[PDB]
Design a binder for these strands. Structure first.
Lengths: 196, 152, 129, 134, 42, 116
RNA sequence: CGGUAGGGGAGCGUUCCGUGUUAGGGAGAAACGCGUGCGUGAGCCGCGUUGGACGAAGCGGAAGCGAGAAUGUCGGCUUGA
RNA sequence: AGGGUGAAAAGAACCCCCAUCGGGGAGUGAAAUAGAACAUGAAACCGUAAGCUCUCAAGCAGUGGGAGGGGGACCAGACCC
C-alpha cells in the first residue's frame, strides 16, 4: 500500500501542477482587459468563480439594535446578507457579508405591538398551536424576535437556509467575534431609529 | 491490452439457481484471495455456494493446468451472474384460476487474475514521477499502470 | 444435425428420386471446381439422390473418432468425403485431358458414351464389355 | 544537461500569448452593444452586402478606454472609428422553435438557423477628444 | 391491499442490496469460523 | 403487395431517444414516455429563451443599481437612467452593468462627469 | 403569417414494378448500432465497426404504405418480492 | 404453438476440473466474438466496469443561467459527460 500510495501522490502533485499552469485568475480591483484573452468575459454577463467569493474573505458587520425599529433594521440586514449591497451581485450564489446583532432584547417596535403581536408555532399535532406575545417571548428568548424577523425576509429555499446561518443574534451588549474586526453597518432610512 | 494474459474466464453455466440468491454469495467474493474464498464457501450456510465453489475450484485448477501459474498468487477479479433460460410451470389455485411458477436458471462467470504477472514491470515503476525514460520512443509501460493515463 | 426438411424426396409410390448423371462408378475423373481443383482420381461409391460421388483419396477430411467400448485413446481417422458431379469431369488418360461426354450408337448394338476432343469410348470397365 | 532536456521536450511551459495594444472600445452594430478590444474576434448579425475577406470601419463607438479612459458627451466620441475585418458569414447553430398546445393535436416543430457573421478587430483609431479620468 | 404503482427501479435496487448485505454478514461469520476450526477447541 | 413496417419505426425513435439521453430515470429509456417528455423539454426551451431576454436585463438593472448606490447617499438607479438620457448617452444596460463589474473605475468616471 | 372543428396548397418516407440480368458490391450489400454534415420538417447524407450477400439513384408507376392511446391483439419481460 | 451450425458432420481424438451436467486447453474449419440452447441479433428487463455526483432535503423531474470536477493516441476562446 505505502509504496503505491506515495508513488500515486507524487503523480497527483505533478498533474495538479501541470494544469495550475494553463490559464490564470485575478481578484476584483482589476482593469477591463488583461493578458488572459481567453473566453469572452466582456460580451457574456459576469458570473462568479468560486475562487472569488470564499467565506474567509467575506466582510462582517455589527448592528447595535438598541432603541431601533425591528422591521426597518431587518430589511437592511437582509440586504447586506444577500449581497444587493454589492455591485457584483448574483441571485444564484451568496456573495454577501455576515451580520452580528447585539442588544436584541432592547429592540423597539411601534404602535401597540408589544402586547397585541403574537408569535405562533404549531407543534404539528391535532391540538398544539402555541401562541405567545412579543414581550412575553422577549422575556424568555429575545434572540428569536430578531432572528425570526430576519429569516422571513431571506429567500426561502436551499440557499435561504445556508445564508441564514450568517446572522448572529445575541441577548446582551458584548459579543465574542472581536477576532473578525466586524465594522459598523450603513443604514438607509430616516424612520430607522425611534423618535426618542 | 492492459492484461489479456492475467486471467482465465471459466464460465460454468445453466446452473439451476435463481440469480438473486446467487448474487447473495458472489457479491462477497468479488475481489478476494482464492484460498480465502474456498474457506468461505465450504463453511457458508447457503445452497448457493456449492455450484459456485465447484466453479471456483474448477477455474483455479483450469488456471494451474492450462496457463500454468500458482494458485496462491491469484484472485477473483470479475464475478458476474446473468439471467438464464426460464421454465414455466402452471400451478392451480383456489376457485378455478391458475398462476405460473417459474424455475429460474443462471449463467455464472468468474474471471480469475494473477497478482504478480505484471509485477516486474510495476515494481520497476517505484521510480518517482519526473523520469520519462524515453528508450523505444515510448516502450512497455503496458501492465496496469492503474493511477493515471495523462499522456497528452 | 441430420436436418429434417433436407432428405430424399419420396415419390407418390414411396421411393426416392434420382438423377441421370454423366458419371458411372468404374471411371477416372478430373475435378474442375472447388478446393481440390485439377486432381485426378476415381469414383468408388455413388449417392444418386444428391448427385454426389465419392472419390477415393481426395476430400482429405479429419475426424475425431471417440473411443467406442473401453478406456482407450480412439484416434483421428483422416477420411474422404462426398463431392458433387457438376464439379467433376471425365479424364481421358491418353492425352490426359478433360472432356464433355456424349452418346453414340455403335455397330455393336449397345449405346455408348464417347468423348469430345479425342473422341474415344469410355464404356469397357467394372462388370465390363 | 540530459536532465534538463528530456523533461523539457515532453512537459512544456507557456509565454504571455501576444503584444496587445490594450485599449478597449464599445461598438454598436445590429442595434446591439459590444465591448471590443484589438487583435480579437466577435460574432454579429449577418452584415448584408459584406464579402468574405473585406475590411470595414465601425462608426458607432460609444466608448473608449485605456490608462486615462474617455467617455462620450453625446453618442459617438467624434472622429473615432474602429477598424475591423470580415472573416466568414456562416449560420448559427440550430435553434428549435416548437409551438405546442395542450390536447388540441397542435404539435408544430420548426428549426431556425439565424445567419450571423464573424469579424476580427485590427485596431482602435485614437480618440483626441474629451479626456476624463481623475 | 393492492399496490398503486410500481416501484420500478432504483428503489428495488436499494431494497435488494440490504438483503445481499445479510449475505455479506453471514460470509463474515463463516470466515471467522474457519480460523476457529484451525487449532485447539477442547 | 404487403408492406411490413420494420425499419421506419425505431429509426425515428432512436432520434427521439437521442434528445432524452441525459434524463433521469424512466424518462430516459421508455419509448412512449420519452416521446411525451421530449416535447415538453422543447416547449420549456422555447418558453425560456424569451424569459432569458427579460431576466438578464433584470439582473443587469440590479447590478447597476447596486453599483450606483455606493456613490452619493441619496443617488439611485431611477435618477441615474434619466440623467443618462438628459445628457444624450446611449449605453445599454448590459455594457453599463458589465463595466460596473470588470472596471468600477469606469463607472466612477461616468458618474463623475454626468453630474457636473 | 395565434388558432379547435374544419377546408385548400406543397412535400417526405415505406415495399413492390418499368428503366435494369444498370454501377455499386466477399478489397464487404441488406441490416444493426453511432455522427462537433445538411433541411422549415417529415427526412437526407458520409462514416468505419458488428454483419455476411444483395442491390442506389434519377425519371416514372402501384399500394396489405407511416401508430401511443381502441378495459385493442400476439409475443417477450418487469413490479408486488 | 413450435423453420434457417456449416460448403462439407469436418459435430470436438487427447489433456485438465470431474459421480453427472457443464466448462477450459487441444484438434477440425474461411469463421467455434458458427459449439448443437449453434445464422443477422433491435427494445424492454437483468447485471459488471470506468468518469463525475447526491445523507437539512420539498421534488411531472425538465428547461434558461451555470459553480467545481472529468475528457478524446488528433496542440480548440471549439466540442462532450
Amino acid at each position: 500500500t505505502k509504496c503505491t500510495e506515495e508513488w500515486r501522490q507524487l503523480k497527483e502533485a505533478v498533474k495538479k501542477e501541470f494544469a495550475i499552469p494553463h490559464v490564470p485568475l485575478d481578484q476584483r480591483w482589476m482593469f477591463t482587459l488583461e493578458e488572459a484573452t481567453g473566453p469572452d468575459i466582456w460580451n457574456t454577463t459576469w458570473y462568479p468563480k468560486s475562487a472569488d467569493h470564499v467565506p474567509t474573505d467575506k466582510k462582517w458587520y455589527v448592528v447595535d439594535a438598541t432603541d431601533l425599529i425591528l422591521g426597518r433594521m431587518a430589511s437592511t440586514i437582509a440586504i447586506h446578507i444577500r449581497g444587493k449591497n454589492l455591485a457584483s451581485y448574483t441571485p444564484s450564489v451568496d456573495m454577501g457579508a455576515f451580520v452580528i446583532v447585539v442588544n436584541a432584547d432592547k429592540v423597539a417596535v411601534s404602535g401597540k405591538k408589544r402586547t397585541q403581536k403574537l408569535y405562533r408555532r404549531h407543534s404539528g399535532r391535532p391540538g398544539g398551536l402555541k401562541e405567545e406575545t412579543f414581550d412575553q417571548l422577549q422575556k424568555r428568548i429575545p434572540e428569536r424576535i430578531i432572528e425570526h424577523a430576519v429569516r422571513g425576509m431571506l429567500p426561502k429555499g436551499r440557499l435561504g437556509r445556508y445564508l441564514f446561518n450568517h446572522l448572529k443574534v445575541y441577548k446582551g451588549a458584548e459579543h465574542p467575534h472581536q477576532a473578525q474586526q466586524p465594522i459598523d453597518l450603513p443604514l438607509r432610512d430616516k424612520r430607522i431609529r425611534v423618535e426618542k | 491490452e492492459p492484461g489479456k494474459c492475467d486471467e482465465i474466464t471459466t464460465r460454468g453455466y445453466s446452473i439451476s439457481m435463481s440469480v438473486d440468491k446467487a448474487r447473495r454469495v458472489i457479491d462477497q467474493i468479488r475481489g478476494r484471495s482464492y484460498a480465502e474464498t474456498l474457506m468461505i464457501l465450504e463453511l457458508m450456510p447457503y445452497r448457493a455456494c456449492y455450484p459456485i465453489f465447484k466453479l471456483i475450484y474448477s477455474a483455479a485448477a483450469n488456471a494451474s493446468h492450462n496457463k500454468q501459474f500458482n494458485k496462491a498468487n491469484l484472485i477473483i477479479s470479475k464475478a458476474e451472474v446473468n439471467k438464464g433460460i426460464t421454465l414455466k410451470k402452471v400451478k392451480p389455485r383456489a376457485r378455478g384460476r391458475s398462476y405460473m411458477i417459474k424455475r429460474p436458471t443462471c449463467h455464472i462467470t468468474i474471471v480469475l487474475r494473477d497478482i504478480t504477472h505484471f509485477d516486474s514491470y510495476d515494481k520497476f515503476l517505484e521510480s518517482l514521477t519526473p523520469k520519462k525514460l524515453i528508450a523505444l520512443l515510448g516502450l512497455m509501460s503496458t501492465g496496469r499502470r492503474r493511477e493515471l493515463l495523462c499522456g497528452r | 444435425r441430420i436436418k429434417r426438411w433436407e432428405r430424399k424426396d419420396c415419390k407418390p409410390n414411396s421411393l426416392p428420386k434420382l438423377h441421370k448423371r454423366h458419371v458411372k462408378v468404374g471411371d477416372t475423373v478430373k475435378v474442375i471446381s472447388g478446393g481440390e481443383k485439377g486432381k485426378i482420381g476415381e469414383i468408388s461409391k455413388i449417392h444418386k439422390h444428391n448427385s454426389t460421388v465419392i472419390i477415393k483419396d481426395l476430400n482429405f477430411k479429419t475426424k475425431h473418432v471417440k473411443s467406442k467400448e473401453e478406456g482407450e485413446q480412439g484416434q483421428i481417422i483422416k477420411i474422404e468425403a462426398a463431392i458433387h458431379s457438376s464439379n467433376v469431369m471425365l479424364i481421358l488418360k491418353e492425352q490426359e485431358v478433360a472432356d464433355r461426354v456424349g452418346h453414340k450408337i455403335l455397330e455393336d448394338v449397345r449405346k455408348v458414351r464417347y468423348l469430345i476432343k479425342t473422341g474415344e469410348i469410355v464404356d469397357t470397365p467394372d462388370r465390363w464389355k | 544537461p540530459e536532465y534538463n532536456d528530456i523533461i523539457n521536450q515532453f512537459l512544456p511551459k507557456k509565454g504571455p500569448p501576444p503584444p496587445r495594444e490594450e485599449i478597449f472600445a464599445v461598438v454598436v452594430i445590429g442595434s446591439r452593444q459590444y465591448i471590443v478590444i484589438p487583435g480579437r474576434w466577435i460574432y454579429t448579425q449577418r452584415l448584408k452586402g459584406a464579402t468574405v475577406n473585406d475590411k470595414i470601419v465601425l462608426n458607432k463607438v460609444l466608448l473608449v478606454g485605456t490608462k486615462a479612459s474617455t467617455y462620450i458627451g453625446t453618442p459617438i466620441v467624434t472622429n473615432a472609428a474602429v477598424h475591423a475585418v470580415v472573416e466568414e458569414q456562416l449560420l448559427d447553430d440550430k435553434v428549435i422553435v416548437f409551438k405546442y398546445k395542450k390536447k388540441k393535436n397542435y404539435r408544430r416543430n420548426i428549426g431556425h438557423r439565424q445567419p450571423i457573421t464573424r469579424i476580427k478587430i485590427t485596431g482602435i483609431t485614437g480618440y483626441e477628444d474629451y479626456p476624463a479620468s481623475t | 391491499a393492492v399496490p398503486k404503482k410500481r416501484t420500478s427501479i432504483y428503489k428495488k435496487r436499494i431494497r435488494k442490496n440490504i438483503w445481499k448485505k445479510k449475505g455479506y454478514w453471514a460470509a463474515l461469520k463463516a470466515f471467522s469460523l474457519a480460523k476457529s476450526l484451525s487449532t485447539g477447541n477442547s | 403487395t404487403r408492406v411490413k413496417r420494420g425499419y421506419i419505426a425505431r429509426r425515428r425513435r432512436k432520434k427521439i431517444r437521442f434528445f432524452a439521453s441525459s434524463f433521469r430515470g424512466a424518462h430516459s429509456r421508455l419509448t412512449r414516455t420519452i416521446a411525451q417528455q421530449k416535447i415538453r423539454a422543447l416547449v420549456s426551451a422555447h418558453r425560456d429563451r424569451d424569459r432569458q431576454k427579460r431576466d438578464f436585463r433584470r439582473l443587469w438593472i440590479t447590478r447597476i443599481n447596486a453599483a450606483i448606490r455606493e456613490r452619493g447617499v441619496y443617488y439611485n438607479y431611477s435618477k441615474f437612467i434619466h440623467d443618462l438620457y438628459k445628457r444624450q448617452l446611449l449605453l445599454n444596460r448590459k455594457i453599463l452593468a458589465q463595466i460596473a463589474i470588470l472596471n468600477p473605475n469606469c463607472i466612477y468616471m461616468i458618474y463623475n462627469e454626468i453630474i457636473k
